[PDB]
Amino acid sequence: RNEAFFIPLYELFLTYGGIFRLTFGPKSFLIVSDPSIAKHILKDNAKAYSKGILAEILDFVMGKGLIPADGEIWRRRRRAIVPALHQKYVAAMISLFGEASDRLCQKLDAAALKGEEVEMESLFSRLTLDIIGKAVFNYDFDSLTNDTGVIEAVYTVLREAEDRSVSPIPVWDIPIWKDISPRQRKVATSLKLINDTLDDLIATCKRMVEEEELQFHEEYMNERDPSILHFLLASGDDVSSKQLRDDLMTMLIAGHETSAAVLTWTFYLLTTEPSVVAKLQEEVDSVIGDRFPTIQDMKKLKYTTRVMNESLRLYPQPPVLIRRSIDNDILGEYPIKRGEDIFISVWNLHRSPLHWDDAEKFNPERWPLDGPNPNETNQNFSYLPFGGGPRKCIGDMFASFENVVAIAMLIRRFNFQIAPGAPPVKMTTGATIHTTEGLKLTVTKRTKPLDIPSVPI
Amino acid sequence: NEAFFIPLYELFLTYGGIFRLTFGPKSFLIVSDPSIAKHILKDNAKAYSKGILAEILDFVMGKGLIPADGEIWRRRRRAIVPALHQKYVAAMISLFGEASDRLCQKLDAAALKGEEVEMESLFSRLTLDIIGKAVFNYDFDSLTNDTGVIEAVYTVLREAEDRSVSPIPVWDIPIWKDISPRQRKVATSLKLINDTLDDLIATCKRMVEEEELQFHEEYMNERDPSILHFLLASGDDVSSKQLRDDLMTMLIAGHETSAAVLTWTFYLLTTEPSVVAKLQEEVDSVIGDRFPTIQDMKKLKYTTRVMNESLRLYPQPPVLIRRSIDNDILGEYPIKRGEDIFISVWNLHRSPLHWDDAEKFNPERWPLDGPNPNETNQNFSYLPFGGGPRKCIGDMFASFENVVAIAMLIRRFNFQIAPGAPPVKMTTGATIHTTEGLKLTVTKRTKPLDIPSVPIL
Ligand code: HEM
Ligand code: HEM
Numbered sequence: 046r047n048e049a050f051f052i053p054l055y056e057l058f059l060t061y062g063g064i065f066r067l068t069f070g071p072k073s074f075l076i077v078s079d080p081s082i083a084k085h086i087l088k089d090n091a092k093a094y095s096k097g098i099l100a101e102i103l104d105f106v107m108g109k110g111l112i113p114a115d116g117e118i119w120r121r122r123r124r125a126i127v128p129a130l131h132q133k134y135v136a137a138m139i140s141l142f143g144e145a146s147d148r149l150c151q152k153l154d155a156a157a158l159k160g161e162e163v164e165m166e167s168l169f170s171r172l173t174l175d176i177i178g179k180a181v182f183n184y185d186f187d188s189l190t191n192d193t194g195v196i197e198a199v200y201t202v203l204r205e206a207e208d209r210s211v212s213p214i215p216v217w218d219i220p221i222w223k224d225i226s227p228r229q230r231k232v233a234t235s236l237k238l239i240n241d242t243l244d245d246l247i248a249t250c251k252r253m254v255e256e257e258e259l260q261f262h263e264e265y266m267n268e269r270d271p272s273i274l275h276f277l278l279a280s281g282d283d284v285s286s287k288q289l290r291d292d293l294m295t296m297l298i299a300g301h302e303t304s305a306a307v308l309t310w311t312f313y314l315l316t317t318e319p320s321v322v323a324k325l326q327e328e329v330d331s332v333i334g335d336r337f338p339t340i341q342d343m344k345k346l347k348y349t350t351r352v353m354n355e356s357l358r359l360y361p362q363p364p365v366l367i368r369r370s371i372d373n374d375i376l377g378e379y380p381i382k383r384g385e386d387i388f389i390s391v392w393n394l395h396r397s398p399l400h401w402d403d404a405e406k407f408n409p410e411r412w413p414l415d416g417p418n419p420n421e422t423n424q425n426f427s428y429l430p431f432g433g434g435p436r437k438c439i440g441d442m443f444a445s446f447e448n449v450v451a452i453a454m455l456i457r458r459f460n461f462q463i464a465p466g467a468p469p470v471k472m473t474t475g476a477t478i479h480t481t482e483g484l485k486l487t488v489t490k491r492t493k494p495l496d497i498p499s500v501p502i
Numbered sequence: 503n504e505a506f507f508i509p510l511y512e513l514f515l516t517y518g519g520i521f522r523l524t525f526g527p528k529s530f531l532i533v534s535d536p537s538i539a540k541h542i543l544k545d546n547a548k549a550y551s552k553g554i555l556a557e558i559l560d561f562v563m564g565k566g567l568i569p570a571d572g573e574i575w576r577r578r579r580r581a582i583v584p585a586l587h588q589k590y591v592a593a594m595i596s597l598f599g600e601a602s603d604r605l606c607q608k609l610d611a612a613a614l615k616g617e618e619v620e621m622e623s624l625f626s627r628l629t630l631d632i633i634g635k636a637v638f639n640y641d642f643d644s645l646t647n648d649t650g651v652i653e654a655v656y657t658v659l660r661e662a663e664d665r666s667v668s669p670i671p672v673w674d675i676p677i678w679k680d681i682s683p684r685q686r687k688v689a690t691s692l693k694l695i696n697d698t699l700d701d702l703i704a705t706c707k708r709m710v711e712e713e714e715l716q717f718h719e720e721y722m723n724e725r726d727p728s729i730l731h732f733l734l735a736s737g738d739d740v741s742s743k744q745l746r747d748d749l750m751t752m753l754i755a756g757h758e759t760s761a762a763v764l765t766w767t768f769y770l771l772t773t774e775p776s777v778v779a780k781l782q783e784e785v786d787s788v789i790g791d792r793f794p795t796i797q798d799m800k801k802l803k804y805t806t807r808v809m810n811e812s813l814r815l816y817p818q819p820p821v822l823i824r825r826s827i828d829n830d831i832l833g834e835y836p837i838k839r840g841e842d843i844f845i846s847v848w849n850l851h852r853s854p855l856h857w858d859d860a861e862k863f864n865p866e867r868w869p870l871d872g873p874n875p876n877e878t879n880q881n882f883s884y885l886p887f888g889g890g891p892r893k894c895i896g897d898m899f900a901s902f903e904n905v906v907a908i909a910m911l912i913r914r915f916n917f918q919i920a921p922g923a924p925p926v927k928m929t930t931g932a933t934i935h936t937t938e939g940l941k942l943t944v945t946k947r948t949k950p951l952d953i954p955s956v957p958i959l
Binding site: 069072098101102105111113209211212213214215216217218219220221222223225226229230386 | 525528554557558561567569665667668669670671672673674675676677678679681682685686
């Protein structure tokens with residue numbers, strides 16, 4: 046169809062190797078699928094690269110215009126935000142993960158009783174939105190149940206950004222010159238709605254901070270408002286309201302669809318291997334049963350963690366990392382000048398036959414169950430679930446626990462199967478990998494071990 | 503590939519004078535009915551804006567994405583129109599004369615070396631040299647030279663034509679990634695043009711202060727008869743930015759339009775030798791080698807018809823873009839606000855239902871001594887200069903410009919399609935360009951009353 050462009054890039058990769066140039070007219074793109082070269086760009090010589098095309102496109106959509114900002118502004122804000130995601134914060138977020146997942150479970154119980162089919166991708170999107178809003182700026186979207194102005198303003202921003210997501214493979218369409226004016230206006234309206242909502246949250250929290258008798262420190266957390274926003278305001282760092290709003294927006298977007306896609310593809314993947322569902326159930330039944338998981342449970346949910354590890358391998362979010370050279374460099378042996386637009390295919394890295402045995406196989410036990418958890422260091426940049434180098438994910442522990450909690454709880458409560466006559470599960474791509482027409486599943490209440498024998502009348 | 507108006511012609515033959523073209527969630531109304539076009543363009547013009555075309559043009563020209571108050575232009579149009587009075591147009595005939603003669607000198611040289619000429623390019627230079635002088639008293643000398651400012655004009659032109667809207671999809675990578683650099687490159691060219699305009703304004707402001715002439719409807723400083731001078735002598739309170747914009751508007755409006763008319767006229771002439779004969783016969787008789795004067799204009803009847811007929815077969819532009827800004831009825835069909843409309847002038851001009859032998863180059867389809875054809879005359883089946891409140895203000899200027907140019911060239915030279923010349927095909931935008939140029943063979947014409955000539959052995 047209008048295939049996810051990383052599929053053609055995979056085929057081209059098998060032929061042409063870990064670095065090749067894609068030419069189309071007077072413009073070209075470098076496609077990097079070599080772990081060493083990816084490590085060079087992302088980590089060893091990261092300072093020679095910007096986010097190029099992706100940054101420019103994203104800035105335009107978000108109202109920041111066509112002038113690339115000083116990169117040191119973000120480096121500064123990132124340094125300020127990272128400490129907010131400390132050990133104690135992540136532990137407190139586990140509770141939020143549990144209750145939010147339970148709300149989804151309530152929705153699933155209802156659908157199961159009525160024997161209805163569910164579209165899981167949509168539901169995972171609502172769940173993770175509710176989580177990130179609460180976690181980041183202490184707001185309850187309640188998108189699992191409602192569709193409000195701000196909820197719709199978020200998805201309008203999302204849909205628009207994804208529609209502008211860059212692909213080096215030409216498609217059949219009318220140029221969008223005619224569309225710039227109306228699209229930017231519609232988006233601007235949605236952004237103002239979100240920003241006004243954020244403004245009310247900033248003000249509310251500033252007030253809570255002034256009235257506090259708490260010393261700020263690296264492990265600071267007001268227990269009544271443990272959000273990142275609260276941490277940032279208790280810091281005393283001088284930041285404009287515009288910048289702070291922009292930061293909250295960044296993490297909302299970074300932390301929403303990412304986890305939703307990971308849950309979606311994990312559950313798709315689970316349908317393809319019943320024996321994996323078996324091991325998963327066995328662990329969850331033993332370790333947590335019906336309990337909301339706690340920080341101590343995370344170490345013990347080993348097989349669940351690996352399932353997530355393996356899902357992110359087969360379906361990376363995003364499947365491509367965009368860069369642009371801003372200085373001279375050598376990629377392997379190949380000299381390059383400033384101005385090269387580069388696509389690092391995480392999809393190719395993760396599924397490379399040269400670096401993975403049975404690359405297309407869903408096998409959570411390809412990394413020893415009791416060994417170390419796989420990461421970009423571990424796997425020599427053949428595995429990049431959370432990126433690598435200075436621009437890597439800052440929500441990686443947050444998101445790992447979020448998804449382990451969600452998977453574990455759901456797998457405890459329900460049996461999931463591909464619905465009869467459900468649409469085929471195909472991919473579209475952007476910031477994350479979406480399904481083409483949803484993930485339609487049959488959900489039934491699971492008969493748990495140690496259930497009391499039941500007898501209908 | 504094809505100029506999109508070609509498929510719209512075929513669709514028009516099937517579906518008639520008004521139909522909806524659908525592609526996804528968006529659609530365009532294609533109007534080819536003279537009555538409906540008269541309704542939109544004239545009778546109920548107030549229910550329509552220039553929609554997509556205006557938005558696309560505003561962006562490229564540095565005016566952003568919020569449409570200005572339409573009343574601003576209506577005000578400025580009222581101020582500019584009086585500048586193109588009878589006395590002014592007469593004085594421009596001299597300029598038309600001398601510029602065409604300069605092209606003739608270039609053509610004389612090429613004939614001597616037996617070189618082939620690419621006429622579209624040369625007509626573009628000719629009309630650029632004419633419009634710059636007539637509008638803001640500047641000599642581009644593009645017929646002889648290549649400067650930065652000349653290149654800045656064509657850089658703007660090329661970009662605008664590349665963004666010109668087509669309702670028919672093409673095969674390409676979306677240009678979201680290119681918005682920032684394109685906007686920047688153009689802005690650089692625009693600044694160069696604007697700085698030149700600023701210097702011209704200043705020179706003229708001083709010349710106006712030190713002159714002792716009363717302003718009136720027939721005002722014209724004989725030393726600087728340009729439109730710019732008239733506007734400054736008016737006393738109209740207008741900002742420099744606005745004035746610059748007006749000069750840009752007319753530069754663009756009066757440049758490529760005439761070039762395309764000359765280009766397609768000369769293409770058409772190669773297709774009908776008997777028309778060239780009649781043309782030569784008239785020109786030999788009426789003006790000979792003389793530069794035409796205002797009095798010659800009435801007498802150059804067949805030349806006028808050749809131009810009339812060229813504009814019929816190759817309208818500039820081939821489509822007029824509108825958008826409904828109120829409710830309306832198009833024929834019988836009810837319409838809401840927000841409809842994007844393409845009036846196909848190409849279809850109107852070539853409709854078999856309204857023209858006998860519509861594809862035939864026949865300057866005598868309007869009786870030679872009858873009235874000159876116009877939008878009133880032809881009941882909106884003929885729109886060389888548009889119609890209604892947004893119609894061309896340079897229509898008399900341009901009609902004389904082209905008659906002068908055609909007449910002189912046909913007096914002096916024989917033109918033929920060059921051997922092995924590229925095929926003449928069409929691309930489209932604000933005007934109809936050829937795909938690969940109009941390569942012609944040019945030889946000095948043996949005129950009646952030429953002294954018998956004998957080359958030396
Ligand atoms: C399964 C969930 C997630 C995945 C797979 C993921 C993945 C990634 C990846 C691969 C990058 C690097 C992109 C690049 O280098 O171009 C990134 C960046 C980032 N992530 Fe995540 N992420 C997830 C969840 C989160 C969460 C929950 C947060 C915050 C609470 C977050 C915050 C960020 C931020 C702020 C960046 C930009 C860092 C920078 O540019 O310096 N992410 N993410
Ligand atoms: C053969 C040459 C020309 C042709 C075929 C032509 C054709 C047209 C047409 C069809 C329109 C109306 C477009 C629409 O309604 O969307 C128009 C508008 C206009 N023309 Fe011309 N034109 C020519 C030369 C000129 C010249 C020489 C000038 C000025 C010196 C000029 C100034 C303008 C202006 C300012 C407008 C905009 C009117 C408005 O929006 O109210 N044009 N032209």
